[PDB]
Amino acid sequence: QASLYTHHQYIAGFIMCGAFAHGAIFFIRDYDPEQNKGNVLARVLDHKEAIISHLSWVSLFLGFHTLGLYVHN
Amino acid sequence: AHVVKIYDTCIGCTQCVRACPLDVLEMVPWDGCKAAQMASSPRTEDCVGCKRCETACPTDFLSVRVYLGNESTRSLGLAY
Amino acid sequence: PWKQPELDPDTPSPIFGGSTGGLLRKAQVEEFYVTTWESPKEQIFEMPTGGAAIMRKGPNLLKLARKEHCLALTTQLRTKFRMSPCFYRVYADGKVEYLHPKDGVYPEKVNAGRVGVNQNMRSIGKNVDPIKVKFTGSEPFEI
Amino acid sequence: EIGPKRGSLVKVLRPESYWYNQVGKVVSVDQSGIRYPVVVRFENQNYAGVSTNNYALDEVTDPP
Amino acid sequence: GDFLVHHAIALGLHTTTLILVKGALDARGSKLMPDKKDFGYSFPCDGPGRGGTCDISAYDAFYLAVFWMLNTI
Amino acid sequence: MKDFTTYLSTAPVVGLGWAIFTSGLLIEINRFFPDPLVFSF
Amino acid sequence: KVKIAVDRNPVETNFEKWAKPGHFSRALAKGPNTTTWIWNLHADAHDFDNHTSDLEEISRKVFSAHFGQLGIILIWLSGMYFHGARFSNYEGWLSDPTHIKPSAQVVWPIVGQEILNGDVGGGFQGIQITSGFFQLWRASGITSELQLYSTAIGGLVLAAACFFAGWFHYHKAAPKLEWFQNVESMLNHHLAGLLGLGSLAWAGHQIHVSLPVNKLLDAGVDPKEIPLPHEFLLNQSIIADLYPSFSKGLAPFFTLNWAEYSDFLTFKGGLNPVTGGLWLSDTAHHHLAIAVLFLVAGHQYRTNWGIGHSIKDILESHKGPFTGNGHAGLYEILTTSWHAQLAINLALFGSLSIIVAHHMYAMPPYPYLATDYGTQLSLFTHHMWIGGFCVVGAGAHAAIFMVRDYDPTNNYNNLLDRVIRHRDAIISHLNWVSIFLGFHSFGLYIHNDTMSALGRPQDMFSDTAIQLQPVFAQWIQNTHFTAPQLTAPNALAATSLTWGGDVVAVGGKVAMMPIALGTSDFLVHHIHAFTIHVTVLILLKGVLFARSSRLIPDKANLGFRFPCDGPGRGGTCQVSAWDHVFLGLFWMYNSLSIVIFHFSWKMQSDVWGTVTDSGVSHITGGNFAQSANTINGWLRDFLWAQSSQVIQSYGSALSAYGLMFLGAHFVWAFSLMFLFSGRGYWQELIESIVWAHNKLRVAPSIQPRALSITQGRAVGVAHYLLGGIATTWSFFLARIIAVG
Amino acid sequence: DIAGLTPCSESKAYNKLERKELKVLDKRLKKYEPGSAPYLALQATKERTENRFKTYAKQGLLCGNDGLPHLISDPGLALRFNHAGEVFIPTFGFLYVAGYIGHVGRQYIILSKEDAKPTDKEIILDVPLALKLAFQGWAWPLASIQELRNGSLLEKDENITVSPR
Ligand code: CLA
Ligand code: CLA
Ligand code: CLA
Ligand code: CLA
Ligand code: CLA
Ligand SMILES: CC1=C(/C=C/C(C)=C/C=C/C(C)=C/C=C/C=C(C)/C=C/C=C(C)/C=C/C2=C(C)CCCC2(C)C)C(C)(C)CCC1
Ligand SMILES: CC1=C(C/C=C(\C)CCC[C@H](C)CCC[C@H](C)CCCC(C)C)C(=O)c2ccccc2C1=O
Ligand code: SF4
């Protein structure tokens, strides 16, 4: 059970990394803003700095506080 | 070899040709700038892609762009 | 320049000791590069692939395995002594090529005698997306 | 004469420029009819290190 | 301790999501390098100019994200 | 005094003064008062 | 010719340049537009070459820099003496060194730190120290805390004097360049004067002060009734009973009857059985002979009175035909380049620190130091690492000299130019011997691991199986053991108990015992030789290829510390000599970590232990001859068999070592961000954060920028080294305190 | 008694942990005379241990199956039951100081930006204006709310550097 869990978890994570990498490959290779102008994709690309900044904020906040209590304990 | 392209944003400080130690870039007369000069790359097959012209480029964004790919015996910088 | 100069086999070479950094088997198989200059006196310079060599009063000859070594030596000479040298390329079959300015007054000048090549009249960033040139063989910057 | 006033604060709308949606000061505007005659100076440097750049007429409007 | 390790897991997922999402959104353009779409998906760098452009590609974002994926799993 | 207090106003000294103030404040709170867990007044 | 050329008041004493932090560099004198201005400010702070091109101002700057460092070290030493005077159990430790652990740091009861005040004995609680200051204060005869207070106050006074001296010798009376270029006077004054005068003063202090105190200390006399050393100094009657040669009273010294001084200037091999350290009479004759050797060597060079040696003549006269011009210009380089002399001095200082660590682990020169396993291990490891750091810095500053101060005009066919000429041959042969040593050391380790894993221990490279006996080292051991018999007949015994036949022990614990060398020691020693050859290959390649290379011919014009020349030629990343030093730091770290692991395991398994009536039992089970031949044996029986006290240190006196261990793990792991990653991703993330701060108008006037590539590499190597050093420090100290 | 956690006053493992800590602390007490200064420090440590165990109990704190007190994080559950002192009131306690630092940093950034060469002000701090803003930041949420409504807190993205995608 332990080997099965760990194997499929690592497989799932590698497949996650591949999914995001191939999404980036979509964004650089074949993406026409003129074809989809003003849609959900173009609007997500419109405020991408907000998304990245909020992800950085929540990651920094979780890491800061979690490491704080782990070191404290 | 590598592809070196110069756009119309160049205004001719004739300093991108000094930073390239491979004689890839040359300066031709032009009329789209005050200095009446424009960078050109006649020996673009002798470029390695060291991007020193990009470091020397003062325009934002850069007038000269070097694109990697299709490497050869001269663009790889081997003396062997 | 006004007339394209051909290097002379007779010209001397600077005195130098044995340096491990130098010509390789690529000089035999592939092409190699040759640098020439005319000296006013005997001065000490540093080779781009070796140590220090005392050069000869008059014509001189250097053989470099790479063009980057030749232009490094050219820039060193021009900076240190206002020397203005020129280098060549010698192929495997004996063909001689002239890469240091064919116009003769260096890439820093213009001379109104060379044609603009690989120049885009559009601004950087105005190039089309790779989807518009997909399955065509032409890059967006190559247009 | 064909561009903005010298010394006036202007806004740059060039997308690929580092100073997109920023405010710069006009230092010189060329009257010879070149590609990018409006030359402006910015208070903050770019990543290269320079602080001045040139733009076309359509890339320069007055900021609100 | 189960709660703390769960929030550490959430931190790992959040940071991996942050880097992968940022690499996907910055895959075609960025303020340091707008023309990333012209250099292909997997290219080394742009050079030492503009302060240094090491690991600027979205492929490099994936490559840095695999370490965080390995740590999270 | 002006020439020295201009140096006194730069960031490394500010990097000490805030640090000394906050550190000493927390030392005195953890010293005079014991180690608590609940803010039940 | 040699004189004192000094310029008076070149720099005004004011805070005008303190007001503007960026003043040494004209590039930083404009303002902090980007956040890299601060890192360039703290980076080019002491780089005096680009501050100005004048060598005289650079020499004054480095002179007062050395003055400031000397004042800082004197402040630190005075603080250590004050800590031993006030918060210590030195009085208790003097009356019982074998049962009371040394302690000189007392923590506050502020937040749970009272558990760190360990029960070290003698009615005292505090941090159990490891520097061995108590052993030094027992060797140099020190009884009460009043004397330590006086030493601390004198050290503070001399530190203030050194800082005032730096201020004077820069701002008030700065020497000229000709004053610093008097190399012959410098060498004579720092050979006869500094080294010789210090050695003679220490020999006199040992003879008149330390010898009677140590003679009364090991005889069972309590230190309270031991007479103060001024009584021994003034009164010949008190010093006459302890040493009968003092009744002669300097008569044998001038009458050439030095054999009468054989009571307190002895020539004895071994250690004092009562204390475990070297005999103080042997150290007295040693420092006296060292003072003689440095007084005679300090009158070699010619300065002002005709006689002597001219270093330029000595260098230019040694010319041999396979070298062309022999040492022709090196006097001109070493009198004009600070970095070349820095490289030479740092290399010799680091190597001599390595010798210091080896020769303290071999012969303990302090009373009750051999039995104090923690002090010996800490001294060996600390001086080991400091020597490695000085050697790596020597390589770095040699590369800096190569980039900056090297010119081809003075050197044409000398040794330096010819080393530049055949650098490819040197690098290729070093690579060959690197691969050869790596294979027939580490492949031997892997093969032993495989044959252990395959159930065939008879095919291993061990003592039971086919063996690689270190015959040369064992023959040297036997020769040194039999050296007092024939080649040094006046020696009482062997110079060290590494190769002896007897075991000394103080307080029931083994002080120093004979060391046996087998196949495992052969494997580890050749592993060390391989690792040092790799590190010297990296440093020497970085030095040699700093000027020019077949890849980048114009590397000289690109400076010493530059990140790259771009992705050209396939990518010239880390091509600078600074990055060569950056990799050599990690290779140094691996080398010295394996070296100190070998030291700790060998000394705990074959030297350190508690003596019994039925034989000698070591700290471990003597498993170094059976487990050091394989990687898994090394792992399980050194890093897992030990470190069981670090994990269970919580709730005890050494829990801070476990906290330090895990924090070191954190910092070592945190460094790999700055090592694996680059700058463009971090710059884009910083751009997104800048947009976030721009949205609600908290945009800093200084533009936030990512760290430079060289800056990122420096941060990564610094955090990595700090984490690894603190990891090994915490593990070693906790293991040697909870057990030894 | 929520989530299967007994109160600390009526927990056997909590008292067993207290007895174990008192035993090891008194173990070191036998190696020193009572009139010594290490004895006084150990006595003060034991008094601090007893005071901490007493104050941690009878305060609504609870623990389960370990003898180590637990904290309740859900609001409402920490309000109906007396557990708001664990994290509910420290939440607003930290946020007040966190908003204090953010507000005084914002006011200093705004004040310095309307000045010639504002990049120097970040490395050359001025004491009287920073200390005046330090003591004029007690009402940070009142200044934050009024700036939020009127656009002085935020900035429209037409003067904000945005990525070129
Ligand atoms: C175990 C080692 C380790 C640790 C602790 C971190 C920690 C971090 N990395 Mg990470 N990383 C690592 C290894 C590690 N990394 C490796 C090996 C890689 C592969 C190259 C990466 C790749 C990577 C990427 C690609 C990214 C990160 C990011 C982050 C941050 C995530 C935010 C967070 O969790 O809150 C903070 C987490 C902490 C652990 C806090 C650390 C600070 C504490 C409070 C100590 C501060 C100093 C202390 C007060 C003492 C002061 C004095 C002292 C300075 C001398 C954080 C700083 C992301 C980031 O920075 O975006 C925001 C990001 O994009 N990392
Ligand atoms: C016999 C005379 C003598 C002595 C003893 C020294 C001693 C020293 N010199 Mg040297 N020096 C001398 C003559 C002497 N110098 C001459 C003639 C020149 C000119 C050629 C120099 C030029 C020189 C330079 C350029 C430098 C030194 C430095 C040093 C110090 C090296 C630090 C060290 O190794 O740790 C040993 C440390 C100690 C022993 C600490 C105690 C230091 C005491 C206070 C110094 C007392 C010695 C002094 C000569 C007494 C007379 C000075 C008087 C005006 C008060 C050391 C103290 C370095 C330095 O700056 O440090 C000052 C350095 O970079 N020396
Ligand atoms: C005899 C000793 C000596 C002397 C006089 C010098 C002098 C010099 N070196 Mg050299 N160096 C030395 C030893 C020495 N170094 C050693 C031992 C090493 C190996 C590590 C180096 C490695 C080295 C490199 C790689 C470089 C220099 C450079 C320099 C120059 C400027 C240094 C500077 O401004 O630092 C500024 C001071 C600092 C940045 C502070 C140091 C902070 C470090 C990074 C961290 C220290 C942490 C500490 C150990 C523990 C604290 C923990 C923390 C949590 C608080 C100057 C010529 C540089 C140069 O340009 O040369 C011309 C350069 O590139 N040196
Ligand atoms: C423990 C980690 C580790 C290991 C093993 C290596 C291994 C190597 N590095 Mg590296 N190094 C590392 C980490 C490591 N690196 C890190 C983290 C850094 C960054 C600081 C560097 C920095 C660095 C530099 C700067 C240099 C090296 C060099 C080397 C080589 C030394 C070869 C040698 O003499 O040994 C012998 C070979 C080995 C130990 C490899 C394993 C051999 C095993 C025992 C197998 C034996 C044969 C086997 C049966 C064949 C298998 C057949 C199969 C295919 C069927 C080798 C390729 C140097 C180099 O190029 O060589 C001179 C060099 O200059 N490395
Ligand atoms: C007071 C100034 C200030 C303010 C108002 C903000 C506000 C913000 N930052 Mg920023 N930040 C600051 C300084 C500031 N930051 C500094 C100095 C750094 C460098 C260490 C950062 C690094 C930083 C990162 C890396 C990130 C943010 C993010 C954020 C957002 C989340 C809120 C938060 O707590 O972030 C957490 C902030 C920190 C962890 C930085 C703490 C550093 C200290 C507390 C600031 C010291 C400022 C000083 C005391 C002011 C001077 C006072 C004056 C009287 C002289 C928010 C928009 C995040 C974001 O994009 O969210 C959308 C994000 O990812 N910030
Ligand atoms: C019924 C139920 C429930 C609910 C649930 C839910 C509601 C869920 C959800 C879930 C979800 C909701 C999830 C999600 C996920 C997601 C993800 C995982 C994503 C990913 C992504 C990616 C990977 C991307 C990619 C890309 C890019 C990068 C770019 C562009 C292109 C693309 C798109 C491709 C509950 C709990 C109440 C209870 C129980 C039952
Ligand atoms: C993480 C990272 C960064 C980003 C790191 C940066 C910008 C440096 C950040 C330094 C901080 C701001 C120093 C101060 C740290 C804390 C604010 C201190 C807190 C102290 C408490 C008392 C509050 C790089 O720029 C980089 C560049 C090149 C290679 C690798 C990397 C790299 O790995
Ligand atoms: S060091 Fe960085 S910028 Fe330079 S070639 Fe390598 S990845 Fe590119």
Whether C44 and chain G come into contact, CB under 8 Å, resolves to yes
Whether D28 and chain B come into contact, CB under 8 Å, resolves to no
Q: Whose CA is nearest to atom 45 of ligand 1?
A: A64
CB atoms within 10 A of CB B22: 23
G649: left (phi over 0), alpha (psi -120 to 50) or beta: alpha
- Which H or E element spans position F4? helix F2-8
Which residues in B lie closer than 8 A to residue G570 (C-beta atoms)? 71, 76-77
3-class DSSP state of B29 = strand
Distance of CA G73 to the CA centre of its chain: 15
Q: What is the DSSP string of D1-57?
A: --SPPTT-EEEE--SSSTTTTEEEEEEEE--S--SS-EEEE-SS--SSS--EEEE-S
Distance in angstroms (rounded) separating the CA atoms of residues H85 and H81:
11
Distance in angstroms (rounded) separating the CA atoms of residues G258 and G275:
28
Distance in angstroms (rounded) separating the CA atoms of residues C37 and C87:
8
3-class DSSP state of C139 = coil
Q: In CATH, which of 1.20.5.510, 2.40.50.100, 3.40.605.10, 3.40.50.960 is domain F1-41?
A: 1.20.5.510
Which CA distances in Å does G687 have to D10, G36, G537, G637?
23, 15, 41, 50
Which residues in G lie closer than 8 A to residue B56 (C-beta atoms)? none
Q: Letter for the amino acid at H49?
A: T
Q: Which two tokens stand for residue G604?
A: 């705990």
Whether F33 and chain G come into contact, CB under 8 Å, resolves to no
Map G89-130 to HEC letters: CHHHHHHCCCCCCCEEECCCCCCCHHHHCEECCCCCEEEECC
- Of G443, G448, G446, the closest CA to residue G461 belongs to G448
Please answer yes or no on whether G568 and B79 come within 8 Å at the CB atom: no
Please answer yes or no on whether H161 and D20 come within 8 Å at the CB atom: yes
CB atoms within 10 A of CB H127: 14
Which CA distances in Å does F39 have to C18, G117, H60?
82, 31, 11
- CA-nearest residue to E33 within chain D is D16
Please answer yes or no on whether C123 and D16 come within 8 Å at the CB atom: yes
Report the sign of the C-alpha dihedral through residues G733, G737, G738, G740, in that order: positive
Q: What is the DSSP secondary structure assignment for residue G195, as one 8-state letter? A: I
Distance in angstroms (rounded) separating the CA atoms of residues G262 and G615:
36
Spell out the residues 6+ positions from residue G658 whose beta carbon is closer than 8 angstroms to its own: G646, G647, G649, G650, G730, G734
Distance in angstroms (rounded) separating the CA atoms of residues A49 and A55:
10
C26, C65, C68: residue with CB nearest B21: C68
- Which chains share 3+ C-beta pairs under 8 angstroms with A? C, E, G, H
Residue F20, burial from CB neighbour count under 10 angstroms (0-12, 13-18, 19+)? exposed
- Is the Cβ–Cβ distance between G268 and G493 less than 8 Å? yes
User: Experimental technique used?
Assistant: cryo-EM
- Of G709, G701, G474, the closest CA to residue G575 belongs to G709
Distance in angstroms (rounded) separating the CA atoms of residues G401 and G557:
14
Shortest Cα distance, chain H CAs vs residue D4, angstroms:
19
Q: Does G434 contact ligand 4 (Cβ within 6 A)?
A: yes
Q: Which residue has the tokens 């490099």?
A: E60
CA H88 to ligand 5 center in whole angstroms:
24
Distance in angstroms (rounded) separating the CA atoms of residues H44 and H51:
10
CA G686 to ligand 5 center in whole angstroms:
12
Please answer yes or no on whether H86 and F39 come within 8 Å at the CB atom: yes
End-to-end Cα, chain F, rounded Å: 47
Whether D47 and chain E come into contact, CB under 8 Å, resolves to yes
CA G435 to ligand 4 center in whole angstroms:
8
Shortest Cα distance, chain G CAs vs residue H86, angstroms:
20
Report the sign of the C-alpha dihedral through residues G137, G142, G147, G150, in that order: negative
- Of E12, E28, E3, E11, the closest CA to residue E65 belongs to E12
Distance in angstroms (rounded) separating the CA atoms of residues G172 and G10:
7
Distance in angstroms (rounded) separating the CA atoms of residues G500 and G363:
12
- Is the Cβ–Cβ distance between G390 and G347 less than 8 Å? yes
Which CA distances in Å does C56 have to C5, C15, C34, C60, G377?
20, 8, 16, 6, 62
- Is the Cβ–Cβ distance between B51 and E47 less than 8 Å? yes
Q: Whose CA is nearest to atom 2 of ligand 8?
A: E54
Q: Does G244 contact ligand 4 (Cβ within 6 A)?
A: no
3-class DSSP state of G61 = helix
CA F7 to ligand 1 center in whole angstroms:
33
Which residues in C lie closer than 8 A to residue G422 (C-beta atoms)? 18-20
Q: What is the DSSP secondary structure assignment for residue G190, as one 8-state letter? A: I
D17, D30, D35: residue with CB nearest B8: D35
- Of G28, G38, G35, the closest CA to residue G690 belongs to G35
- Which chains share 3+ C-beta pairs under 8 angstroms with E? A, B, C, D, G, H
Distance in angstroms (rounded) separating the CA atoms of residues D51 and D57:
19
Which CA distances in Å does C127 have to B69, D43, G480, G685?
19, 29, 80, 25
- The vertex-G216 CA angle with G215 and G218, nearest 5°, equals 75
Q: Does A20 contact ligand 6 (Cβ within 6 A)?
A: yes
Which CA distances in Å does G65 have to D49, G68, G189?
33, 5, 20
Which CA distances in Å does H34 have to G403, H26, H39, H41, H46?
68, 12, 6, 11, 14
Distance in angstroms (rounded) separating the CA atoms of residues D22 and D12:
6
Distance in angstroms (rounded) separating the CA atoms of residues G734 and G658:
8
φ, ψ of residue A37 to 5 degrees: the values are: -100, 125
Please state whether beta strands C119-120 and C52-54 pair in parallel, antiparallel, or not at all (unpaired): unpaired
- Is the Cβ–Cβ distance between G618 and G609 less than 8 Å? yes
Map E18-32 to HEC letters: HHHHHHHHCCCCCCC
- Which H or E element spans position G7? strand G6-8
Spell out the residues 6+ positions from residue E53 whose beta carbon is closer than 8 angstroms to its own: E32, E33, E45, E46, E47, G678, G679, G680, G683
Q: Which two tokens stand for residue G13?
A: 């004493």
Residue G10, burial from CB neighbour count under 10 angstroms (0-12, 13-18, 19+)? middle
- Is the Cβ–Cβ distance between D39 and D30 less than 8 Å? yes
Distance in angstroms (rounded) separating the CA atoms of residues G172 and C22:
53
CB atoms within 10 A of CB G174: 22
Which residues in H lie closer than 8 A to residue G31 (C-beta atoms)? 117, 119-120
3-class DSSP state of G740 = coil
- Is the Cβ–Cβ distance between H163 and E37 less than 8 Å? no
CA G527 to ligand 3 center in whole angstroms:
29
> CB under 6 Å to ligand 5: residues?
A 53-54, 56-57, 60; G 689, 692-693, 696, 698; H 101-102, 104-106, 108, 130, 133-134
Which CA distances in Å does E15 have to C101, E31, G352?
54, 22, 48
Please answer yes or no on whether G708 and E51 come within 8 Å at the CB atom: yes
- Is the Cβ–Cβ distance between H5 and H63 less than 8 Å? yes
CB atoms within 10 A of CB A50: 14
Spell out the residues 6+ positions from residue G608 whose beta carbon is closer than 8 angstroms to its own: G373, G509, G510, G618, G619, G740
Please answer yes or no on whether G705 and D45 come within 8 Å at the CB atom: no
Work out which ligand 8 atom sits closest to the CA atom of E48.
Answer: 3
- Is the Cβ–Cβ distance between C75 and B21 less than 8 Å? yes
- Which H or E element spans position A49? helix A48-72
CB atoms within 10 A of CB G159: 20
Longest CA–CA span in chain D (Å) reads 32
User: Helix (H) and strand (E) counts for chain H?
Assistant: 7, 3
Q: Does G571 contact ligand 8 (Cβ within 6 A)?
A: yes
Distance in angstroms (rounded) separating the CA atoms of residues H99 and G664:
33
- CA-nearest residue to G110 within chain F is F31
- The vertex-A38 CA angle with A35 and A43, nearest 5°, equals 115
Q: Letter for the amino acid at G709?
A: I
G615: left (phi over 0), alpha (psi -120 to 50) or beta: left
Q: Letter for the amino acid at D28?
A: S
CB atoms within 10 A of CB G504: 20
Distance in angstroms (rounded) separating the CA atoms of residues C72 and G167:
45
- Of E31, E25, E32, the closest CA to residue E61 belongs to E25
- Is the Cβ–Cβ distance between G492 and G502 less than 8 Å? no
φ, ψ of residue D50 to 5 degrees: the values are: -75, 165
Q: On the CB side of H83, how many CA atoms lie within 13 Å of its CA?
A: 20
Helix E2-25 with A48-72: angle, nearest 10 deg: 150
- Of G258, G264, G268, G276, the closest CA to residue G232 belongs to G264
Q: Which two tokens stand for residue G407?
A: 């010119």
- Is the Cβ–Cβ distance between C92 and C30 less than 8 Å? yes
Q: Which two tokens stand for residue G113?
A: 């730190």
Beta-bridge mates of residue G510: G505
- Is the Cβ–Cβ distance between G298 and G188 less than 8 Å? yes
Q: What is the DSSP secondary structure assignment for residue G461, as one 8-state letter? A: B
Q: Does A70 contact ligand 6 (Cβ within 6 A)?
A: no
- Is the Cβ–Cβ distance between G395 and G583 less than 8 Å? no
Whether H4 and chain E come into contact, CB under 8 Å, resolves to no
- The vertex-G346 CA angle with G342 and G350, nearest 5°, equals 180
Q: Which residue has the tokens 């040197």?
A: G426
Q: Which two tokens stand for residue G249?
A: 């009273």
Distance of CA C60 to the CA centre of its chain: 16
Distance in angstroms (rounded) separating the CA atoms of residues G422 and D41:
52
Per this entry, what is the length of chain C? 143
- Of B73, B75, B59, the closest CA to residue B4 belongs to B75
Distance in angstroms (rounded) separating the CA atoms of residues G242 and G207:
12
CA C83 to ligand 8 center in whole angstroms:
33
Q: Does G443 contact ligand 4 (Cβ within 6 A)?
A: yes
3-class DSSP state of G434 = helix
- Is the Cβ–Cβ distance between B70 and B18 less than 8 Å? no
Residues 637-696 of G with CB under 8 A from A: 685, 687-689, 691-692, 695
- Is the Cβ–Cβ distance between G367 and G97 less than 8 Å? yes
Which residues in H lie closer than 8 A to residue A42 (C-beta atoms)? none
Q: Does E32 contact ligand 8 (Cβ within 6 A)?
A: no
Q: What is the DSSP string of G383-413?
A: HHHHHHHHHHHHHHHHHHHHHTT--TTT-SS
Report the sign of the C-alpha dihedral through residues B20, B23, B25, B31, in that order: positive
Q: Which residue has the tokens 């003055």?
A: G67
Q: Which two tokens stand for residue G597?
A: 């692991």
CB atoms within 10 A of CB C81: 15
Q: Which two tokens stand for residue G31?
A: 């303002």
Distance in angstroms (rounded) separating the CA atoms of residues G717 and G736:
28
Q: Does G450 contact ligand 4 (Cβ within 6 A)?
A: no
Distance in angstroms (rounded) separating the CA atoms of residues E16 and G692:
20
Distance in angstroms (rounded) separating the CA atoms of residues C117 and B19:
19
Mutation target vs H (from D12, D21, D47; most H CBs, 10 A cutoff): D21
Distance in angstroms (rounded) separating the CA atoms of residues G526 and G533:
10
- Of D54, C3, C84, C106, the closest CA to residue B27 belongs to C106
Shortest Cα distance, chain G CAs vs residue H88, angstroms:
25
G169: left (phi over 0), alpha (psi -120 to 50) or beta: alpha
Q: Which two tokens stand for residue G207?
A: 């003879």
Pocket test for ligand 3, best of G47, G53, G69, G402 (most atoms within 8 A of CB): G47
- Of G518, G520, G513, the closest CA to residue G617 belongs to G513
- Is the Cβ–Cβ distance between H82 and H60 less than 8 Å? yes
Q: Does G435 contact ligand 4 (Cβ within 6 A)?
A: yes
Q: What is the DSSP secondary structure assignment for residue G620, as one 8-state letter? A: S
Distance of CA C127 to the CA centre of its chain: 32
